[PDB]
């Protein structure tokens, strides 16, 4: 195999992030064997030095001379830091000149929690490390590639980031899933701009042989958290005691005592009985309700949900003795995970890191593929109906009738026409009691109050100025106006109006900057994430995530950025649509797309634009009309969550 | 490049259909250079001999000995013939033993007409040549691959056959598009069964450099046909004259005389004026309405539509002198076609046949990809919203109100519960005047009349026994009961219950046969094609194409075959949804899928099954309620045609 690689990439320069181990180290190894000069970037110096020494030794074995000139390293490189990415490019260009191949391989697992347990800064950090870093390196290296007349950008995505026309849920990993979907969406939308000189593609393996036990423990700890939280929420619906008083029932941390307490609500007694029946008697989770870590996550969910509880409520919690989960429990769960994964591999074999790197070095030699995602995955398939669609009608008159007297929250600022039309449809057609218009600025509040002057005067339209504090604004709306039914989350900001590539012989100074790409993610992805994270614990809410608007006259740049957002947000919507099922609130969350892939499909005249606006109202109604608990079966429930419809 | 291929496929045996030229000849050439022994199959002996001589000469140049043992040919091989495919396999195994790589490359362009102008036997012939031949060779060679423990099936599909989660319309080529989608669907659904031993993938390039002028002439001739037919149909709606009398206005074959005739309906005068204004004055199509060929296609559409006209009506038509379309007209149209294609290539370069073959020889060396489609296409992209979806409601109460007094046609036999529930919803909920239940057999008629006994007695449910004569049965329904509004086309037959692969050391005798795969296409694709072809010219019809049913307890084979049909039919639905826009009738045609990809998504209990059946009724209503002409804009019209919704 080493002989057959000779000369394949001779004369090429490759930059590989996360190049000290895994797929990254193997790509670096095989590209060096194929003749390329490689720069391997990573955090840990020692692991990076070992990888460089191993590759250099192998090059010398197969006949290469001056092996030190062929494999360089960039240690202490944290791809989540913009300054460190600029230093990495400086070092790489100083060593080898123009980079031919940018291998965006570095990646972190992320927060590994459900959205409702995910710190906002943790989500942002995953986007910086896994996604924004890819645009940042492309922005720095593409001008030089264009100048020389050739280049290749390869983003190492994941099958769990989804596929071109089918999003995939990845519960407890939404930050990771979104970053992976974005790496693929970058290849899908930038190909038109990077061509003809530069190819851009992604690879999307799933499991790669180089884990199930670590995953198993997280699953068991998460299950305990979810079960406890859902039981407290369900008990609170029909019990007059405060959440503080209900949480007091947990303070002895005694499963049998809670089960046997006739004053405990039915939901909590049944939960304790389930812990005893399902539990391994040797596990302390069979006899203790929770530990310090789970108690902290539970308290955070309750505080986020608006419950009043002292910060030290679990300070005296008895600490359960190890093991909280036995080896038998962890092993049983690890086997379930393993079997679930193996069952998705139609070649019945997980590809190795070497297999993925080998497939990639041959992808890098092709010159006719661009804007695609390759799947060197072992025939990995997760069967699922695609989450998208454009032919829909309205929900039934009986579901629409349930909107009479409802409290609607609309979030937005730049889409004034959509916000005005939607507030009016809810108040004038569907008899909603009130609409709370949560804007970003006082200028936004003035604009919306002017548009909805009649409803403001009648006390039917109220405004809230969120600024950069959307969660606190939602809490103010809850205090002032009551909990919402429909929640329609539109972006506060429009998309930027800037070029996405520069002219061949230009400095690219006006091209979308690395900081502007981070801002695009903040306003168009993080905005929705924060709202969904908060609204997920608001009992009775039905949330619609709305993407930016494309029109028949949008620029090609506008279409590219809007479709990048649309695809990337689908991963978030699909993931949180599944996570919703693990909560007692089990809210509806779906996406309504004001972005189309094709300019030709857009309305072209006043009549067609009117039809589009009516479809927007209908799409929002379809995902915001309530779904009766009786109709909310496992079958129907999944159809009404995590979907995306195109207006 | 020839040196780097050495040993890549040494020890391999490849069978390449259509191996005398194009992509096929290049795959044969490059696989032989890589060390494989190749069998090249094709119709023409001379072209095949030349290709074999060229490859053998190149092998000798690079050092191969005994070149006659490495490249064999199978001339006079018509892949549309089952007996000829059996002879091809016999010849190949006799020459080289077990085939490692099956390259399903042979393909014909097909009928190259809109569905309404496509002979049923022409459509069948394209399926035999392009699609059924692929299953047939797989069925013959996969047992030997499984026995040796390895194999690879590569189907040469087209980007115009669509993508995994996004169908694509290919107007005037529905037979070709369907065959291509089926080649890809075969890889998507058989991968689970063929693994671990055998990989199955497709390639989907679009344009390949080795045409636009030939395409241009077909477009211009088609435009004349469509314009003439649409004007006659539109004039007939408001004119008391018979179609025979309206066609008499065309018999002098004089554009200026028709334009100047004050007795001619407005639609025909305006059409003649448009021919004169748009036409090149040197083209005889500017002065003559039609020629013999177009007149025959026009007469066929009118006869199919039920118009009474003598077979010799155009026997005395003046023959227009050449050129019917000038070089300037043909060249202008050829440039439009070329620019349209080039604009879709994000690498701004059409791949050559050599480029596609090179990409393929490297795909054939990979061992970790299966069930995928590769795109060595030059970055080819046709931006479009995916045609599928599962979140939908009902059409508006005002659209549903228009079903009062409607004539409904239901076609089916095996889905008795669905047919009974739908006939009842139309009659009992939506006040339809009558339902015509078109079954296959008298036993089917007896079953449906028993289920709908009450409606039969009241004269609200009538039956028709179609047998294998569905078009004639529809014509009998038109005579007896009147033209339909909603038309719901379900398959007469269930899917077969047979294995799709055999045990490693078995003879595979019970595995789905080549004849059974042809029958599956007849009952599950051709059935819908024939109904859509006929109903497309029935003014006021709204047609729903329904796929087979999958359930929570369907076998994995059932799921595979149903999803193969679902995906393949999406290509047909999308294509005819666009072709509908070229007709005055402009009917609605959409697909309602009773097949899901995922067993886990299926209803599991009586309540959920009830919810699924209600969703089936809602999906059918959404695509069968009328779309007002005023609302049928270019924008809204495309959303209501060619879609597929998942129940």
């Amino acid at each position: 195999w080493a002989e057959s690689l000779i000369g394949l990439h001779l004369g090429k320069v490759a930059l590989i992030t996360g190049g000290s181990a895994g797929i990254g180290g193997q790509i670096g190894r095989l590209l060096a064997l194929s003749g390329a000069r490689v720069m391997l970037a990573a955090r840990d110096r020692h692991k990076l030095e070992q990888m460089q020494a191993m590759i250099q030794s192998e090059l010398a074995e197969v006949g290469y001379t001056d092996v030190e000139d062929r494999v360089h390293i960039a240690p202490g490189c944290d791809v989540s830091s913009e300054a460190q990415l600029a230093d990495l490019v400086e070092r790489t260009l100083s060593a080898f000149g123009t980079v031919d191949y940018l291998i965006n391989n570095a990646g972190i697992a992320g927060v590994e929690e459900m959205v409702i347990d995910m710190p906002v800064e943790g989500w942002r950090h995953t986007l910086f490390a896994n996604l924004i870093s890819n645009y940042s390196l492309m922005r720095k290296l593409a001008p030089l590639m264009k100048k020389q007349g050739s280049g290749y950008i390869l983003n190492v995505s994941s099958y769990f980031g989804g596929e071109k026309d089918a999003a995939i849920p990845y519960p407890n990993r939404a930050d990771y899933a979104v970053s992976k979907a974005g790496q693929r969406a970058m290849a899908e939308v930038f190909a038109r701009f990077l061509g003809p000189e530069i190819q851009i593609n992604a690879i999307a393996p799933g499991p790669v042989e180089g884990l199930f036990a670590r995953r198993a423990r997280l699953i068991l700890e998460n299950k305990r958290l979810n079960e406890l939280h859902a039981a407290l929420i369900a008990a609170a619906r029909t019990d007059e005691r405060s959440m503080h008083e209900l949480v007091e029932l947990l303070l002895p941390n005694d499963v049998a005592a809670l089960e046997q307490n006739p004053a405990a609500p039915t939901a909590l007694r049944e939960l304790a009985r389930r812990f005893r029946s399902e539990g391994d008697p040797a596990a302390s989770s069979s006899s203790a309700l929770l530990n310090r870590s789970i108690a902290a996550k539970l308290l955070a969910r309750l505080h986020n949900g608006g419950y009043v509880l002292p910060a030290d409520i679990f300070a005296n919690l008895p600490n359960p003795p190890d093991p909280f989960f036995t080896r038998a429990q962890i092993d049983r769960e690890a086997r379930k995970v393993r079997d679930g994964i193996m069952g998705m591999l139609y070649l019945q074999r997980m590809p190795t890191e070497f297999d993925v790197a080998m497939a990639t070095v041959y992808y890098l030699a092709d010159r006719v593929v661009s804007g695609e995602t390759f799947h060197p995955s072992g025939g990995l398939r997760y069967e699922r109906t695609p989450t998208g669609g454009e032919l829909f009608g309205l929900p039934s008159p009986e579901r629409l009738a349930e909107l009479v007297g409802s409290t609607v929250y609309l979030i937005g600022e730049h889409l004034t026409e959509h916000l005005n039309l939607l507030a009016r449809a809810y108040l004038e057609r569907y008899g909603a009691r009130q609409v709370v218009m949560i804007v970003e600025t006082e200028t936004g509040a003035e604009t919306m109050r002017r548009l909805l002057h009649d409803h403001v005067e009648a006390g039917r339209l109220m405004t809230i100025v969120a600024g950069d504090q959307i969660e606190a604004a939602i809490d103010q709306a809850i205090t002032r106006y009551g909990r919402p039914g429909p929640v329609v989350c539109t972006p506060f900001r429009p998309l930027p109006t800037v070029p996405l590539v520069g002219r061949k012989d230009s400095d690219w100074s006006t091209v979308l900057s690395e900081a502007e790409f981070a801002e695009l993610c903040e306003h168009q992805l993080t905005h929705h994430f924060r709202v969904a994270r908060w609204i997920a614990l608001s009992d009775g809410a039905r949330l619609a995530l709305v993407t930016p608007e494309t029109t028949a006259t949008s620029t090609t740049e506008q279409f590219a950025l809007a479709n990048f957002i649309k695809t990337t947000l689908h991963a978030f919507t699909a993931t949180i649509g599944v996570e919703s099922e693990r909560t007692a609130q089990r809210i509806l969350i779906n996406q309504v797309d004001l972005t189309r892939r094709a300019r030709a499909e857009e309305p072209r005249d006043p009549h067609e634009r009117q039809q589009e606006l009516e479809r927007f109202i209908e799409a929002v109604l379809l995902v915001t009309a309530p779904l009766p608990p009786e109709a909310d079966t496992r079958y129907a429930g999944r159809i009404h969550r995590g979907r995306a419809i195109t207006v």
Side-chain angles (χ1 to χ4, degrees), chain A:
Chain A
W1 59 273
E3 183 75 34
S4 177
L5 288 175
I6 294 168
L8 187 67
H9 299 290
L10 183 61
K12 298 292 194 280
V13 171
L15 168 60
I16 304 105
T17 62
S20 64
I23 294 165
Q26 295 300 301
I27 288 170
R29 179 208 180 179
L30 302 181
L31 281 173
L33 283 162
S34 74
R37 284 188 294 163
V38 306
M39 174 67 78
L40 310 178
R43 312 263 320 252
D44 189 66
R45 182 184 273 275
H46 179 72
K47 200 163 79 181
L48 199 47
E49 285 170 347
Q50 284 188 152
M51 183 52 78
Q52 177 190 37
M54 199 166 298
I55 300 164
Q56 282 179 357
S57 180
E58 197 172 14
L59 293 189
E61 254 169 37
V62 301
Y64 285 97
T65 66
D66 308 299
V67 301
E68 304 217 304
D69 296 339
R70 319 193 68 80
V71 188
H72 280 207
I73 64 165
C77 178
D78 182 345
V79 297
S80 76
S81 164
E82 177 56 22
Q84 294 182 48
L85 292 173
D87 195 58
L88 172 58
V89 168
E90 176 170 64
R91 182 177 181 88
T92 308
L93 297 176
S94 179
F96 306 135
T98 298
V99 174
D100 295 285
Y101 304 159
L102 168 61
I103 311 304
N104 275 318
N105 172 76
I108 64 174
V111 179
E112 304 185 275
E113 298 287 350
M114 284 165 64
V115 172
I116 56 170
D117 307 307
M118 181 179 290
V120 180
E121 259 321 303
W123 155 272
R124 283 195 186 100
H125 180 66
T126 302
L127 300 193
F128 271 96
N130 290 7
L131 174 59
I132 296 164
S133 60
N134 285 215
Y135 180 77
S136 175
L137 291 168
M138 169 172 78
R139 180 57 171 83
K140 292 174 180 55
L141 297 169
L144 281 174
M145 290 175 181
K146 188 158 187 176
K147 279 169 211 306
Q148 74 169 8
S150 64
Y152 201 128
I153 298 164
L154 190 286
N155 291 350
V156 180
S157 182
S158 173
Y159 187 84
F160 300 110
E163 290 173 289
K164 183 175 172 273
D165 297 288
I168 190 173
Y170 203 41
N172 299 62
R173 306 289 308 276
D175 57 329
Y176 179 84
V178 164
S179 73
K180 298 292 120 179
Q183 285 182 292
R184 171 179 48 84
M186 188 181 304
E188 293 175 0
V189 311
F190 277 83
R192 189 203 194 101
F193 298 90
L194 295 171
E197 299 87 357
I198 306 159
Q199 288 166 273
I200 185 171
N201 295 298
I203 62 165
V208 178
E209 178 117 81
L211 193 277
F212 306 132
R214 194 196 160 256
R215 166 114 187 240
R217 186 187 292 278
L218 292 180
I219 285 165
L220 297 181
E221 289 167 339
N222 192 238
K223 169 186 156 76
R224 178 55 55 100
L225 171 59
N226 286 316
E227 291 176 347
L228 281 161
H229 186 234
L232 284 169
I233 300 300
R237 293 179 176 134
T238 57
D239 198 278
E240 68 307 321
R241 282 169 286 196
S242 70
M243 187 51 76
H244 192 164
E245 290 175 313
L246 298 173
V247 168
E248 273 168 44
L249 298 161
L250 308 183
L251 294 180
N253 204 17
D254 189 325
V255 178
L258 181 62
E259 181 189 44
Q260 291 155 13
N261 184 356
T266 292
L268 286 170
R269 296 190 72 194
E270 290 178 347
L271 175 82
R273 180 177 179 163
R274 187 186 178 179
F275 289 171
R276 293 193 73 211
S277 61
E278 295 184 356
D280 183 328
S284 60
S285 57
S286 289
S287 55
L289 290 159
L290 68 188
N291 58 26
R292 288 183 312 257
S293 175
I294 297 167
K297 294 179 180 66
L298 177 58
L299 188 49
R301 286 196 185 184
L302 295 171
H303 278 153
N304 291 350
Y307 293 106
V308 182
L309 300 145
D312 70 358
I313 194 162
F314 297 122
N316 299 326
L317 197 74
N319 292 306
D322 289 340
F324 192 64
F325 296 112
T326 59
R327 286 177 178 90
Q329 288 178 310
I330 290 155
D331 290 351
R332 278 195 303 273
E333 189 58 36
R335 282 192 299 276
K336 271 187 59 177
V337 171
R338 181 199 69 204
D339 294 352
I341 291 163
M342 296 309 296
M344 292 196 282
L345 297 172
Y346 292 171
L347 288 178
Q348 305 185 11
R349 178 193 173 270
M350 196 179 293
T352 65
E353 294 166 349
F354 179 88
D355 292 329
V356 175
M358 191 59 82
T360 304
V361 304
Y362 282 92
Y363 299 148
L364 290 162
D366 155 80
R367 295 282 169 265
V368 303
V369 180
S370 194
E372 305 302 335
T373 301
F374 302 110
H375 294 96
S377 66
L380 184 72
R381 171 92 51 86
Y382 182 79
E383 300 284 0
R384 68 216 187 258
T385 298
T387 74
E390 83 190 300
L391 181 58
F392 58 83
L394 266 167
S396 74
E398 296 76 20
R399 280 183 65 199
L400 291 164
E402 295 306 296
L403 289 170
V404 174
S406 66
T407 291
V408 168
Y409 287 6
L410 301 185
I411 296 160
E413 182 141 313
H414 82 283
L415 299 171
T416 65
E417 190 173 17
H418 295 78
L419 292 166
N420 178 36
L421 287 189
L422 202 51
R424 291 183 178 277
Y426 279 123
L427 297 164
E428 304 167 16
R429 299 189 205 171
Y430 303 106
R433 175 160 64 98
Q434 59 184 334
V435 169
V436 181
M437 178 67 255
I438 304 174
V439 299
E440 184 179 14
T441 72
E442 282 282 3
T443 300
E446 173 185 61
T447 299
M448 293 319 303
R449 292 167 77 93
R450 168 181 62 82
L451 291 174
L452 294 154
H453 68 113
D454 52 330
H455 293 294
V456 167
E457 283 294 296
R460 284 187 298 264
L461 191 295
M462 276 69 74
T463 55
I464 296 173
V465 175
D468 66 6
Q469 295 300 332
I470 189 54
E471 302 91 346
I474 289 162
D475 282 359
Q476 295 290 319
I478 294 161
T479 299
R480 299 169 194 175
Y481 307 121
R483 297 249 168 204
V487 182
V488 185
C489 183
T490 75
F492 288 148
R493 310 297 182 85
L495 293 171
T497 304
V498 280
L500 297 179
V501 291
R503 287 171 290 107
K504 184 189 177 80
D505 299 306
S506 73
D507 56 11
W508 285 52
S509 66
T510 73
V511 176
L512 182 71
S513 74
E514 304 90 332
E516 288 168 335
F517 185 85
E519 249 201 296
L520 171 75
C521 295
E522 179 71 33
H523 303 308
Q524 308 301 332
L525 298 171
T526 303
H527 175 71
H528 295 300
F529 159 82
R530 290 168 68 184
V531 170
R533 174 168 172 278
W534 216 249
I535 295 297
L537 295 192
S538 192
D539 214 10
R542 285 93 63 182
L543 175 64
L545 302 184
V546 182
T547 56
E549 182 196 37
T550 55
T551 78
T553 64
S554 283
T555 64
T556 51
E557 292 84 3
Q558 209 62 214
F559 268 99
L561 295 187
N563 278 280
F564 165 77
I565 293 308
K566 177 172 177 172
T567 298
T568 303
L569 198 65
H570 288 160
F572 179 72
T573 303
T575 299
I576 201 167
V578 172
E579 299 185 355
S580 296
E581 307 276 10
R582 291 93 198 266
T583 69
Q585 293 92 336
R586 207 189 159 196
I587 72 153
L588 300 188
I589 303 171
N590 295 277
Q591 191 174 319
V592 172
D593 293 313
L594 286 181
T595 290
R596 282 179 173 281
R597 285 234 187 95
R599 177 191 305 282
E601 294 175 355
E602 299 288 0
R604 286 171 208 185
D605 64 38
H607 185 199
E608 297 178 346
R609 283 185 231 107
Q610 211 174 327
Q611 290 181 308
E612 180 183 60
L613 288 165
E614 185 53 25
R615 284 175 50 78
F616 170 65
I617 295 169
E618 290 175 334
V620 166
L621 289 169
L622 185 65
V623 303
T624 61
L627 183 67
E630 51 266 45
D632 207 350
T633 53
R634 177 217 45 87
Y635 167 72
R638 65 146 298 280
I639 297 164
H640 289 81
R641 289 177 181 85
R643 309 302 93 199
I645 49 181
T646 294
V647 176

